Amino acid sequence: RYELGEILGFGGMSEVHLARDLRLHRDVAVKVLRADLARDPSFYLRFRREAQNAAALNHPAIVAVYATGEAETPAGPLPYIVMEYVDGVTLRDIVHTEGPMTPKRAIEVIADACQALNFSHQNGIIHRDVKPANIMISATNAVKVMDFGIARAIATAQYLSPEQARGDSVDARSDVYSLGCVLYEVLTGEPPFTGDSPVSVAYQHVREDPIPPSARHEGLSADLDAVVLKALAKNPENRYQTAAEMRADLVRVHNGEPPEAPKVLT
Numbered sequence: 181r182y183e184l185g186e187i188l189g190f191g192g193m194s195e196v197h198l199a200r201d202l203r204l205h206r207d208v209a210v211k212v213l214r215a216d217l218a219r220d221p222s223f224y225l226r227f228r229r230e231a232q233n234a235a236a237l238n239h240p241a242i243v244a245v246y247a248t249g250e251a252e253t254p255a256g257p258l259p260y261i262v263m264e265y266v267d268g269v270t271l272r273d274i275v276h277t278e279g280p281m282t283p284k285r286a287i288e289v290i291a292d293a294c295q296a297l298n299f300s301h302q303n304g305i306i307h308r309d310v311k312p313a314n315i316m317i318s319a320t321n322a323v324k325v326m327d328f329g330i331a332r333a334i335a336t337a338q339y340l341s342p343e344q345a346r347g348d349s350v351d352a353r354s355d356v357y358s359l360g361c362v363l364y365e366v367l368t369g370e371p372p373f374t375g376d377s378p379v380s381v382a383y384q385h386v387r388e389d390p391i392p393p394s395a396r397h398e399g400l401s402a403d404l405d406a407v408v409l410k411a412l413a414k415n416p417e418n419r420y421q422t423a424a425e426m427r428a429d430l431v432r433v434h435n436g437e438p439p440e441a442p443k444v445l446t
């Protein structure tokens with residue numbers, strides 16, 4: 181049914197192909213598990229779970245999942261996921277090709293992401309992996325959040341929250357944090373913490389305060405600082421408790437209004 185075509189992109193887990201649905205005549209994105217990882221149960225499982233978790237979401241700002249299955253290739257069974265096709269670019273790409281967005285644009289985009297996440301949080305779903313690569317902007321400039329993660333067991337990493345690097349409990353406020361990180365990098369052109377390993381970056385995430393955005397990049401403002409740093413506060417209790425709260429504050433900043441976030445001085 182699906183005539184696959186060009187490679188749209190590469191992820192740490194999969195190859196995503198543009199394809200044509202020949203029964204409905206629409207372009208779709210087909211996510212195919214990396215050949216070599218299919219043999220590892222943990223990954224096959226992860227892949228399938230994410231699929232079923234994401235199909236439970238239906239919002240204009242969230243990439244819809246349409247179908248599943250497994251191609252019975254000569255090598256073995258490659259599971260794949262059929263989804264709504266976004267013709268556009270991830271924020272990572274945007275940052276890598278065009279530099280930091282204008283404050284207002286950043287605000288608009290992140291605010292849309294908030295709606296996606298809030299809708300999700302309401303149908304009881306933590307994303308878990310909010311990062312620049314998991315948010316796309318369409319040719320027609322719609323924001324689209326994707327690659328929703330899944331509750332895992334217990335005994336990148338550059339946008340994970342503190343409670344994630346420790347083995348603590350995870351809820352909506354962690355999406356709030358990591359989103360904070362996205363906004364940060366998208367305002368300044370850099371992720372808030374960098375280093376020579378995951379470990380050290382994990383250290384920074386839970387130990388060192390971020391440099392205020394206005395202090396890493398020109399024409400930002402103290403109010404943005406406020407919002408960004410409240411989003412990136414270490415203890416979930418001191419952050420925006422909900423996506424909507426964060427969004428409301430972003431809206432305040434977008435207009436000429438002062439945000440409710442505690443103030444930040446340089």
Ligand SMILES: Nc1ncnc2c1ncn2[C@@H]1O[C@H](COP(=O)(O)OP(=O)(O)OP(O)(O)=S)[C@H](O)[C@H]1O
Pocket residue numbers: 188189190191192193194195196209211243263264265266267268270313314326327336
């Ligand atoms: N719905 C889509 N429409 C168009 N391109 C897409 C779409 N989904 C993914 N891509 C592209 O293919 C990519 C990877 O998709 P992912 O779902 O993030 O794969 P992944 O294996 O989960 O990567 P991770 O985050 O390392 S596990 C890019 O970041 C894209 O440019």
Ligand SMILES: [Mn+2]
Pocket residue numbers: 191193327
């Ligand atoms: Mn993924």
